[PDB]
Amino acid sequence: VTYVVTERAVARIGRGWLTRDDKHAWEKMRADVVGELEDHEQFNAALDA
Amino acid sequence: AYTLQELLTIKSDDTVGRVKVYEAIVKGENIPEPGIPESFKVLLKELQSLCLNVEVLSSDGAAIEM
Amino acid sequence: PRQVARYRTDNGEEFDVPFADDAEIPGTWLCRNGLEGTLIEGDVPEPKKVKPPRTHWDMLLERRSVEELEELLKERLDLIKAK
Amino acid sequence: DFVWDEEESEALRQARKDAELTASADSVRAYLKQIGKVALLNAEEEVELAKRIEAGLYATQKLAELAEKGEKLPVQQRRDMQWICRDGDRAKNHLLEANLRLVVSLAKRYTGRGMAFLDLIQEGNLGLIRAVEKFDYTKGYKFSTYATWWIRQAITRAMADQARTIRIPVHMVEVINKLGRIQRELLQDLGREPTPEELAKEMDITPEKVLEIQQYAREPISLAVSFTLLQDQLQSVLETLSEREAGVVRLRFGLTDGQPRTLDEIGQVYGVTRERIRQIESKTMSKLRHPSRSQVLRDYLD
Amino acid sequence: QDRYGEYFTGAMGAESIKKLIENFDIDAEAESLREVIRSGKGQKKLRALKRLKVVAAFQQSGNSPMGMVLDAVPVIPPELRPMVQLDGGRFATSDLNDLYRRVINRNNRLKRLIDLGAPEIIVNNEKRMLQESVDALFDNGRRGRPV
Amino acid sequence: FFDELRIGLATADDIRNWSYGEVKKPETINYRTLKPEKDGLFCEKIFGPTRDWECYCGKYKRVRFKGIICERCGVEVTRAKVRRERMGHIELAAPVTHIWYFKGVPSRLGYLLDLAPKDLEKIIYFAAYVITSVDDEMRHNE
Ligand SMILES: [Zn+2]
Numbered sequence: 001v002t003y004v005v006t007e008r009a010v011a012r013i014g015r016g017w018l019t020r021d022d023k024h025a026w027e028k029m030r031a032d033v034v035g036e037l038e039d040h041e042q043f044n045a046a047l048d049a
Numbered sequence: 050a051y052t053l054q055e056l057l058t059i060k061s062d063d064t065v066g067r068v069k070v071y072e073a074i075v076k077g078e079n080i081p082e083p084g085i086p087e088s089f090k091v092l093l094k095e096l097q098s099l100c101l102n103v104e105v106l107s108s109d110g111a112a113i114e115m
Numbered sequence: 116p117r118q119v120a121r122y123r124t125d126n127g128e129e130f131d132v133p134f135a136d137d138a139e140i141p142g143t144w145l146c147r148n149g150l151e152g153t154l155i156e157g158d159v160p161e162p163k164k165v166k167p168p169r170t171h172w173d174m175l176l177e178r179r180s181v182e183e184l185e186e187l188l189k190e191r192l193d194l195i196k197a198k
Numbered sequence: 199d200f201v202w203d204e205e206e207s208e209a210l211r212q213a214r215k216d217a218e219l220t221a222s223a224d225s226v227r228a229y230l231k232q233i234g235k236v237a238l239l240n241a242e243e244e245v246e247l248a249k250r251i252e253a254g255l256y257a258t259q260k261l262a263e264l265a266e267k268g269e270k271l272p273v274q275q276r277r278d279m280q281w282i283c284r285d286g287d288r289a290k291n292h293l294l295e296a297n298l299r300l301v302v303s304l305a306k307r308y309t310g311r312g313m314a315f316l317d318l319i320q321e322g323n324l325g326l327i328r329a330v331e332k333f334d335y336t337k338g339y340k341f342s343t344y345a346t347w348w349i350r351q352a353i354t355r356a357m358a359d360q361a362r363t364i365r366i367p368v369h370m371v372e373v374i375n376k377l378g379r380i381q382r383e384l385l386q387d388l389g390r391e392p393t394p395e396e397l398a399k400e401m402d403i404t405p406e407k408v409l410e411i412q413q414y415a416r417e418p419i420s421l422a423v424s425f426t427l428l429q430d431q432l433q434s435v436l437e438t439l440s441e442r443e444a445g446v447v448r449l450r451f452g453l454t455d456g457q458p459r460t461l462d463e464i465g466q467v468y469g470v471t472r473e474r475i476r477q478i479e480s481k482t483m484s485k486l487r488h489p490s491r492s493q494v495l496r497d498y499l500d
Numbered sequence: 501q502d503r504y505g506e507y508f509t510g511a512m513g514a515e516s517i518k519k520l521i522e523n524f525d526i527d528a529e530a531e532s533l534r535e536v537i538r539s540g541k542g543q544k545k546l547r548a549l550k551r552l553k554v555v556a557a558f559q560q561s562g563n564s565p566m567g568m569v570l571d572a573v574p575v576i577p578p579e580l581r582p583m584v585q586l587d588g589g590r591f592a593t594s595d596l597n598d599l600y601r602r603v604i605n606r607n608n609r610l611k612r613l614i615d616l617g618a619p620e621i622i623v624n625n626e627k628r629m630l631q632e633s634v635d636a637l638f639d640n641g642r643r644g645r646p647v
Numbered sequence: 648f649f650d651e652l653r654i655g656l657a658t659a660d661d662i663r664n665w666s667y668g669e670v671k672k673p674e675t676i677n678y679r680t681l682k683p684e685k686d687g688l689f690c691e692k693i694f695g696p697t698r699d700w701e702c703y704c705g706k707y708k709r710v711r712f713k714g715i716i717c718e719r720c721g722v723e724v725t726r727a728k729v730r731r732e733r734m735g736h737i738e739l740a741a742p743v744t745h746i747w748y749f750k751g752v753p754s755r756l757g758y759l760l761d762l763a764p765k766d767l768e769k770i771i772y773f774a775a776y777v778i779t780s781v782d783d784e785m786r787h788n789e
């Protein structure tokens with residue numbers, strides 16, 4: 001679930017730019033999104049629902 | 050207290066104090082007093098660098114010294 | 116020997132500097148606080164040839180005529196007078 | 199779509215481990231949020247906005263110029279001129295806010311070269327300001343066509359200026375980058391990290407100079423009583439000499455001042471001719487060299 | 501702001517917190533919190549009790565809280581930042597020596613950026629970057645994995 | 648010897664008093680010559696000379712110039728490597744909060760201002776606005 005949500009969020013954050021670029025950008029954006037998700041209260045509440 | 054202090058500072062990693070004590074002994078002067086090692090100086094400088102206003106005060110609530 | 120000179124900065128602070136005796140002290144000195152002060156005697160008021168940096172007005176004049184911009188301004192005024 | 203593989207699991211594991219807490223350079227999303235709030239301009243509004251900017255600038259200059267001579271403007275004209283003065287900077291702000299996506303996209307290329315992504319974005323913003331200042335609609339070209347040059351120049355110059363711990367001028371970092379550019383092709387051709395001689399041959403510069411440039415391209419990496427007694431003995435030995443003749447030795451060797459006064463200067467301070475100072479030097483030097491005066495100073499061998 | 505700007509004043513960033521601390525009612529707030537301590541009968545009393553420990557420290561100790569916001573940042577002496585060469589053609593450097601640099605850049609640009617009257621978004625981004633840089637300088641890891 | 652020592656919040660006045668100069672530029676040293684750069688992080692006239700009894704340009708190289716400050720150079724001829732204790736400061740364009748008093752739990756600044764840490768997170772890093780004052784005297788009449 002986290003991977004899917006992270007991919008969807010990254011695709012819309014870096015609108016049209018970062019797709020299929022080297023690791024130096026897409027991987028870092030994924031890492032930031034995942035780190036935020038792990039601390040996100042409502043996302044964890046949903047995963048608990 | 051004094052013997053331990055001179056063992057830990059004068060007879061150890063304290064270059065300025067070591068040279069001063071050797072000079073005093075050879076010249077016959079009474080041994081100079083120690084104080085303010087370099088480690089404390091650098092620690093105080095770092096504390097100031099962290100914007101912490103550290104200062105040393107004399108007596109039970111008196112002015113600064115050097 | 117050693118001299119001493121008094122300087123003041125634009126913000127109003129004043130500073131002391133022990134310059135050399137046999138040398139000539141400059142009219143302006145970079146003080147401790149970082150501002151460029153002036154020697155209080157007030158002698159030698161040079162103009163400093165402080166030309167302004169290349170501004171937007173010149174950067175525009177370099178590609179326009181004095182009449183074309185006036186015509187453009189007239190056009191804009193006519194546009195707003197549609198009210 | 200819905201496909202899961204080891205690479206997908208590994209990618210998630212990397213992202214999970216690669217960032218446990220947010221970093222200062224990677225939290226650009228706050229900035230990217232504010233870009234999306236402004237829509238893109240087309241040619242027509244672009245040209246109208248540029249014309250408004252120019253009209254505002256001219257109105258401002260006219261208002262400033264009329265001040266010295268007086269010539270107070272009428273109320274209606276005064277108010278409308280000031281309105282256009284404001285409209286000029288309004289249009290400038292609008293056009294600048296419109297095009298931040300261009301600078302973001304152009305700075306995305308040079309990321310990871312030793313400078314932060316957000317710093318590159320800010321330098322692109324600074325270059326885009328110059329781009330909007332210089333852009334002229336009369337040429338008929340689109341704003342993106344012209345502003346790209348200025349943004350690229352600003353980004354590359356900022357990299358040349360701030361990308362290294364030890365600053366290296368632009369005209370040097372140019373050749374240090376050319377070194378790597380040539381080295382890639384030379385390694386591909388020869389299949390090895392080659393020697394300085396062939397590199398000099400290819401680059402049309404001397405091997406010593408190319409080696410020096412390579413050295414300039416390196417990156418920094420992260421982490422006495424006898425002396426005082428001897429001085430006294432000088433005066434003690436000189437005590438055997440007369441004051442008149444002792445002074446010459448003091449001035450010649452610069453006792454307690456350090457300046458090696460020349461034979462004539464000792465003459466000037468004494469008031470006599472210079473060859474006499476050489477004669478005094480010779481006589482006093484012969485006197486002092488005798489063991490009866492320099493007895494104990496030999497202990498100070500070095 | 502468009503409708504009622506004259507009847508209030510708002511801001512954002514550390515510049516606004518500076519004003520908030522300036523207008524702080526140090527004595528009145530402390531005494532009102534102490535009254536809640538004498539009046540409350542539960543968690544509402546606990547919050548006052550535990551935040552008075554911080555509020556009073558700036559009252560009973562004399563020093564003002566204006567030091568929380570910095571108008572200047574000191575630089576540690578160079579000898580505490582070794583920058584000596586290494587035999588072999590390399591320079592040994594201290595890590596924080598770079599952090600200071602990163603601050604100065606983002607400071608100088610800001611001064612230039614304000615000078616040329618750039619839009620509000622760019623200046624706000626620059627100020628956020630400067631805050632983030634000083635944070636990294638003083639304590640890396642508080643935000644997360646650092647530069 | 649001293650008998651006690653205290654630490655406290657440092658104000659801009661204290662920092663400006665400690666500093667002997669401002670590091671206006673980020674340069675450290677010249678690339679081809681290892682001499683310190685002017686107004687840089689290793690500036691000699693700010694933090695003192697690197698060599699005893701001499702300055703950057705070498706006009707003065709004698710111990711008798713103890714209290715002399717170089718004319719061309721601005722470096723104060725000093726007794727030894729005072730670079731170890733002499734320190735500088737930076738005049739930065741906009742105020743910034745101190746990280747130690749802001750981050751962590753409890754947030755001292757938040758407790759002082761009675762602002763929740765999440766709300767204070769937004770205000771400092773330019774995510775939301777905060778009203779510093781409201782003219783209650785005027786508004787309710789208007
Ligand atoms: Zn000098």
